[PDB]
A paper describes a structure:
A GluA2 mutant (F231A) increasing NTD dynamics phenocopies this behaviour, and exhibits reduced synaptic responses, reflecting the anchoring function of the AMPAR NTD at the synapse. The Phe231 to alanine mutation, which destabilizes this interface, slowed desensitization recovery of GluA2(F231A), both in the absence and presence of TARPs (γ2 and γ3). The role of B/D NTD interface stability in this transformation is supported by a desensitized (R/G-edited) GluA2(F231A) structure. The NTD dimers of the mutant receptor also transit into parallel O-shape conformations, and the LBDs depart from two-fold symmetry, which again is coupled to an increase of non-domain-swapped receptors (relative to the resting-state receptor). Rotations are larger for one of the two LBD dimers (C/B versus A/D), and movement of the B/D subunits is less pronounced than in GluA1, perhaps due to subunit-selective contacts between the NTD and LBD tiers. Transition into non-swapped LBD dimers probably involves relaxation of the critical M3 gating linkers of the B/D subunits, as observed in an NTD-deleted NMDAR structure, thereby entering non-conducting (‘deeply desensitized’) conformations. Closer analysis of the three sets of desensitized structures reveals a gradual transition of the LBD tier into four-fold symmetry, which is greatest for GluA1 and smallest for the edited GluA2 mutant: GluA1 > GluA2(F231A)-Arg743 > GluA2(F231A)-Gly743.
Author numbering:
A (entry chain C): 766 to 773, 785 to 823
B (entry chain C): 570 to 626, 633 to 716
C (entry chain G): 5 to 42, 55 to 84, 92 to 162, 173 to 210
D (entry chain B): 521 to 551, 569 to 618
E (entry chain C): 423 to 506, 511 to 520
The structure:
């Protein structure tokens, strides 16, 4: 009644997903910083 | 030349082993650069060597007293409960107190109830019970 | 050459919008041996509906259940709501409007830069979408023409963005001249 | 490395190159040897851990370069390991 | 089951006849020192709701004080039962 009832290498994207998230996030932060500087310079023009 | 911004860039680039656009030309600058280069070599080599293992990846009564996140119970009126209630050993008396004080009542009303409560608690509920039932369960789906 | 650039950017924007929209719409993203409407059988799964093929009841399509750690729940949510592919489609749409409005209000020559930023951002959104889709699926198979349509949409979108920025640079070069 | 990682490495290469080019050449107030062709070369070389011959000088370009450097370090270390 | 077989041989050895009955309370058993009540199998046998128990009932001090057990037919011991992925930022683990 105890034993006769017996019933019991490559790297995946999941391993390195964090680095992809950081890359894209950084690309975004960079685009934002660039646009902010561009807007500041546009307003800076001596009217 | 190395202002604060260019110096932060030189250092970051050295650590990421990604080469440079400028390098110190003076004696003091070259001493600083040398030690940073050595530090980078040891630390990056060690990161890569240990990334050669991290590459993709509780079992006692004392361990049970150690784990307070897990709540563990016995049959409410069961020989496990009575053995905990009338215990004289320290570990079992501490377990009896924990059962009597782990609120709500960790006790279940049937053995299969305690099993299913564990099987439906994602390891946040544990069952204290007789060894024969465990042997049968661990041997059966 | 010039003048052709505006036509090429316009054509590209329409192509990218259509490819990404079709991709989000269709369901041939993944060919896997799953379970049809509720044995095992090949199932063209998509962003929303997993549907059965080569079965006793092929052609029966079922809404995918994206739920049976907080990170797992958040990823499941971000993948259940294809927010990134959808955001990609919306951004591509806004980019299209900017390119189209270029012909009018042509004196501003500053809305075309907006078109470029929209197209490039759409590409970045497409990438995050592919990453989350693949990751979620991982927690034999193959990818169908919908997945590759999404990828082609990303490539065309990035090229269209590059062209837009190129023509913005040219317009300011002419203005400064 | 799995097929998916290679595919996304290519997509990211294209993205990093386009963003470096945009961030370096879009402002009329800058008019940087970073056209689109040079941007693609900088990115490829950075991934293969080879020389640069040019390095972004602006804040935004440096942000893009830094993240591409980190990505390259983790991915190539993982390939070798 | 195992005890149903055993009870069959218990009846064979005793010669008597038996009716297999379950405990409604579904407990092996214990006593409330305040209500002076017994629960489960012991409650059934202490109260006469039955007369014999060829089942996985456990002998213990408290229940012996108020009912009669048999010679233990098997020994047991208390034991513990428990419920039987790369991080997003696993790249910092080395």
């Amino acid at each position: 009644w105890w034993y006769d009832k017996g019933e019991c290498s490559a790297l995946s994207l999941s391993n390195v997903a964090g680095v992809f998230y950081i890359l894209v996030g950084g690309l975004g932060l960079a685009m934002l910083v660039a646009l902010i500087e561009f807007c500041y310079k546009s307003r800076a023009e001596a009217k | 030349e190395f202002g604060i911004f260019n110096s932060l860039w030189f250092s970051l680039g050295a650590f990421m082993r990604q080469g440079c656009d400028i390098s110190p030309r003076s004696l003091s600058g070259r001493i600083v650069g040398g030690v940073w280069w050595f530090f980078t070599l040891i630390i990056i080599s060690s990161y890569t060597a240990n990334l050669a293992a991290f590459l993709t990846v509780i079992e006692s009564a004392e361990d049970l007293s150690k784990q307070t996140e897990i709540a563990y119970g016995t049959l409410d009126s069961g020989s496990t409960k009575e053995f905990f209630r009338r215990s004289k050993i320290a570990v079992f008396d501490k377990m009896w107190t924990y059962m009597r004080s782990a609120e709500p009542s960790v006790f279940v009303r049937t053995t299969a109830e305690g099993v299913a409560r564990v099987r439906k608690s994602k390891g946040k509920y544990a069952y204290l019970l007789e060894s024969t039932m465990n042997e049968y369960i661990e041997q059966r789906k | 050459d010039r003048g052709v650039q505006m036509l090429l950017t316009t054509v590209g924007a329409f192509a990218a919008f259509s490819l990404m929209t079709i991709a989000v719409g269709t369901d041939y993203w993944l060919y896997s041996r799953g379970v049809c409407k509720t044995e095992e059988v090949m199932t063209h799964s998509g962003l929303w509906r997993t549907c059965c093929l080569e079965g006793n009841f092929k052609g029966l399509c079922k809404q995918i259940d994206h739920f049976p750690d907080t990170a797992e729940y958040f990823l499941r949510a971000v993948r259940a709501s294809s927010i990134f592919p959808i955001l990609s489609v919306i951004l591509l749409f806004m980019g299209g409007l900017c390119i189209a409005a270029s012909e009018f209000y042509k004196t501003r020559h500053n809305i075309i830069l907006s078109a470029g930023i929209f197209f490039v951002s759409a590409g970045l959104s497409n990438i995050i979408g592919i990453i989350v889709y693949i990751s979620a699926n991982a927690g034999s198979y193959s990818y169908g023409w919908s997945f590759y349509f999404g990828a082609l949409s990303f490539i065309i979108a990035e090229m269209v963005g590059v062209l837009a920025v190129h023509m913005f640079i040219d317009r300011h070069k002419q203005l400064r001249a | 490395l799995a097929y998916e990682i290679w595919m996304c490495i290519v997509f990211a290469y294209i993205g990093v190159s386009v963003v470096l080019f945009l961030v370096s050449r879009f402002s009329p107030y800058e008019w940087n040897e970073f056209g689109i062709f040079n941007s693609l070369w900088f990115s490829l070389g950075a991934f293969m851990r080879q020389g640069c011959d040019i390095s972004p000088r602006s804040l935004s370009g440096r942000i893009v370069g830094g993240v591409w450097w980190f990505f390259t370090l983790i991915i190539i270390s993982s390939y070798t390991a | 089951g195992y005890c149903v077989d055993l009870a069959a041989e218990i009846a064979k050895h005793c010669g008597f006849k038996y009716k297999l009955t379950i405990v409604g309370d579904g407990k092996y058993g214990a006593r409330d020192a305040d209500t002076k009540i017994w629960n489960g199998m012991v409650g059934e046998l202490v109260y006469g709701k039955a007369d014999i128990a060829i089942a996985p009932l456990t002998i213990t001090l408290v229940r012996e004080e108020v009912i009669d057990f048999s010679k233990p037919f098997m020994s047991l011991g208390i034991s513990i039962m428990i419920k039987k992925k790369p991080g997003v930022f696993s790249f910092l683990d080395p």
